[PDB]
Each structure stands twice: as C-alpha cells, then as structure tokens.
Amino acid sequence: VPLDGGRFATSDLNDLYRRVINRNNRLKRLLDLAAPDIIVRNEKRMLQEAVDALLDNGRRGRAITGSNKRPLKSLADMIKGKQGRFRQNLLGKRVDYSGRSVITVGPYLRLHQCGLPKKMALELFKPFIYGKLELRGLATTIKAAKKMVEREEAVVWDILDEVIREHPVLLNRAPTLHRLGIQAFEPVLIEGKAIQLHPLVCAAYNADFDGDQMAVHVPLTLEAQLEARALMMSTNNILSPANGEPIIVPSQDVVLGLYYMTRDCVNAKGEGMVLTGPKEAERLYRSGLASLHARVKVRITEYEKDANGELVAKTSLKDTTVGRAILWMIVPKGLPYSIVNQALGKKAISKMLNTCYRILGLKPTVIFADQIMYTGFAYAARSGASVGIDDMVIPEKKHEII
C-alpha cells in the first residue's frame, strides 16, 4: 500500500516468491536449449534454497536479508513465539466499549458502588441513549439525537441518570493473578475525571493509591450482566477459595480507631459510676463529660438463641470501658458480650467477623463491617493522631552496651 508522499510499504513474502519464479523461468529457458548440466544443477540448488528459505529462512542455510542486514521474514513467525496469532492476536484481544482512568478513593460509599466521571460514562452508553431519544420522540431520528447530544442538554443528564441505575460494570487492575483481580460494581456518577474506589479492596487488587490505573468493561448483554451481578459482585467475593479466610481485613486505620477507643486507662475521670445503657455514653461523651477509655460499670442486654434457632433475651451488668458499651449498640442481636472485653487486635476482628458470618448468615456481617468502617474512621478523625521527633524513644541503656 502507498504512503502520504506516494511511498510504499510491503510484505517481504513477495520478494521471496519473485526469486523462485525467476529461477524457475530461467530453468525452463535453459531446458529449451538442452544446455550443459552444471548450470542446471546450480539452478536447482538455488531453487530449493529459495524454496525452503521462503518457508523458514535461517534454519538450514544462513538467512537472507534486505539491505538493512535484517531477515526477510518467512511464514512460520506468523504462528510462533509471542508474535504469533495464538499469543498475540487470537487469545489476547483489543476491545471497544472499554476504557480506563486513574483512580482514587470513596470512603463513604457502599461496597457495591463505584465512582464514574461524567463524560466517559456519557460516551459509553451512547446507543442506549439514542434508542430512548427515539423512544421519547425527542430524537425522532438519529441525527437529532447526535446533535442534541453534542449540545449536551439537561435532558441528556436526566436520561443518563435514568439508564445507569441498576446498570453494573466491570473493573480491572493489571496484572490478573487470581480471579479477584477484577470485580463487578454498580455505578455512581461523579464530577471529575478520576474514579473513586471503596478502600477495602486495595488488597484483592494489590492496589496502592500512588498513581495506578484501571480499566473498565461492560456486560452489554444481559446474561453477562446478571452473572456479574450474581458472581463477581463485591458480596460473593469475600473469602479465598485457596484457604477459607476473610479477605476483608481492615488494614491499618480503622483498626487504630477501634484499638484507641476500645481501651482501658485509669487516669482521666468519672471512674466507677452507673448507667442504663450505651445511649448515655453517647449522651455524655458527645457533651464530652467522660473518658471513653475508662472501665466503669453499666448495664447491657445480651441475646442468644440456645433454643432451636430462636432468641433468648437477658441482661446484666458489666465493669467495662465506655467504648465497649457503645460498640454494643451496633452488634446484631446474636452475640455474647465477651466479644468486646479486650482492646481488639486485628485477629480479634478477624474472628469477630468469622463468627459473625458462620452463625448469623451473610448480610448482617456485611452491614456490620460497613459500620465498623464508618465509625472507626469517624473516631479516628476524632482521635487526634500524629507523631513527632519526640515520640522517637532512645533507651539510655544502649551506649554502655556498645
């Protein structure tokens, strides 16, 4: 095919066909004369050499090149290595109805939600829009849809909101190690050009928020839509098939909030007084009368289903820190009160959740987890939390040892 300035670009295959043909034609011309045999011999040496070099250049004899000193690429490497159809073209695919961007965080979100900047998603559900603008009769035909769309009317955004509800999508970090490297989320449109991301699935993706990128794909049809809503959704993908553990570890922050608050000092104040329930711990501390971290006696109402899966209510009193009181506010009606009577190391939360799932079923665990995130972020912000050069500690018993 030709180029901008009339120049050409070609396939070397042709070049190899040519030599073959020349030689064969020569050979006929020669044969018509019954010539001495030696030139015939040479003619066929050069023949077969041309032939197999067509098939596969530098295998038998050393390779033919152009002027560049580079091979005249044969067939076989249409099929071979990575370059071949298999590993390049046939198994691995370039794709339309796809996109990507840099990402970031949505903390407040719910797990199933994912941030969408306007214009890309706008582009992506284009033919749906066109169908519905012929539906409403705004765009009686296609060009009117196009033209109002490139005019970006408010109705455009209204119908965008109309469509994208319940309209899930597919998410991809690179590289795909295990099957959770991708997941199936539900959109929430946002005003930017960068995605927000629910924090906890940094680990399924090995993601850190320092400048990575993700891509997005689409179950255009319904079957795949429903599969992703039913299989790859954030709710199914909560335990490794490798070893049966929660992959929902709250790594580093919310842990801190919980450990800090759910803790037993002695020093502050109000040590050893009496309440009805946790709502009074809220009542005081939101007025700021008590140390949350202070063992004090209160009354709690714990529930149980020692019956054949039927609740068994009771209540009793506890010398406990205030935060434990508060955090009982959120436990969903199945647990003992021993669950909280320590200052909550990481694995305590692991087993918190494990128990929560294996007893109570699934969805309460999810909900429980969500509020753990929200509240621990909240009181982490409340916490007051920083470090200094003075928080570095040097034992006086170092220099003498050395």
Binding site: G6, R7, F8, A9, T10, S11, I142
Partner: protein
C-alpha cells in the same frame, strides 16, 4: 534491470544529475544553489523539480519496529480513507423507499423508469427507447420528482 521496476531514462537522468552536481560542486566548492542545476542542466526547473519526486524516493517495508525498544511496529500506526460506515447506507436505503414513496403518485413509466434504473441498477434510456417520446417529458417529470423530494428534511449534507 529485471529486479528493478522503475524506468531507464529515469536513471539516465539520475546518473546525469549525479555527474553534474558533483562536477559543479567541485567547480564551486559548496552546495545547494539549485538555480545552478537549472543552469547547467538548462532544460527547465519544473523538469528536475518533478524528477526529484520521480527518482529520489524509494520503497520501504512494513514491519520495521518503532524505535526505543520495540514498542510497536509501523503496522499499528496506519490509517485508511475508504472505510465502512453503517448509517449512510442505512439512510440511503431509507431514501430509496422514500423515492418510491414520492413517485408512486406520478406517471406510470417514470415511476418504473426511476425505480428500475435506481433500484436494481439497470438502464435509463432503455426506457426512452421504449416510449419513443424523445425524453423531454422525462426531463420535466424528473425535475418534478426533485421538486417533490425538496419538500422534506434530511441531514448527512
């Protein structure tokens, strides 16, 4: 000569500019004052001005890697002008049935004239031979069909 596929007098002129330009570059001792080329090879400017196109531009290959290690080839940085497009044929067929829609109220032969010439890509004056009226009535009626289709709206202009 067999392998090369460019003409001969071409290469004569190429040899000639080679000899001449070297000869005169040593006459002078510096370069690129093409008016001298117009002089010494005093035929015309446009002649060589074309010739430089003709000669000084050779072919290249397709799969040369793209430079700063093998990011991609030249086979991925290519473009086309003769592409497919789905809606132009769509609306063309729409306009085809609009043509019959427009002309179905108009005289019987011209209906069939413009149908069978425009539909199945057949003969026009084949019909002018059938009637044998001189194709003047054809002319005004064709004008009228245009006046009839200039009663509606369509973009793709």
């Amino acid at each position: 000569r067999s392998r090369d596929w460019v003409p001969r007098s071409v290469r004569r002129n190429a040899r000639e500019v080679a000899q001449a330009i070297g000869q005169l570059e040593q006459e002078l001792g510096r370069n690129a004052t093409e008016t001298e080329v117009a002089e010494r090879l005093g035929i015309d400017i446009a002649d060589y001005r074309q010739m430089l196109l003709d000669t000084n531009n050779s072919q290249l290959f397709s799969y040369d890697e793209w430079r700063e290690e093998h990011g991609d080839s030249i086979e991925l940085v290519t473009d086309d002008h003769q592409r497919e497009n789905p809606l132009q044929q769509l609306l063309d067929s729409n306009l085809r049935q609009r043509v019959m829609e427009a002309i179905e109220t108009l005289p019987e032969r011209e209906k069939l004239v413009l149908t069978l010439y425009y539909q199945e890509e057949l003969n026009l004056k084949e019909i002018g031979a059938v009637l044998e009226v001189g194709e003047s009535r054809v002319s005004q009626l064709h004008s009228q069909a245009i006046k009839r289709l200039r009663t509606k709206l369509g973009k793709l202009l």
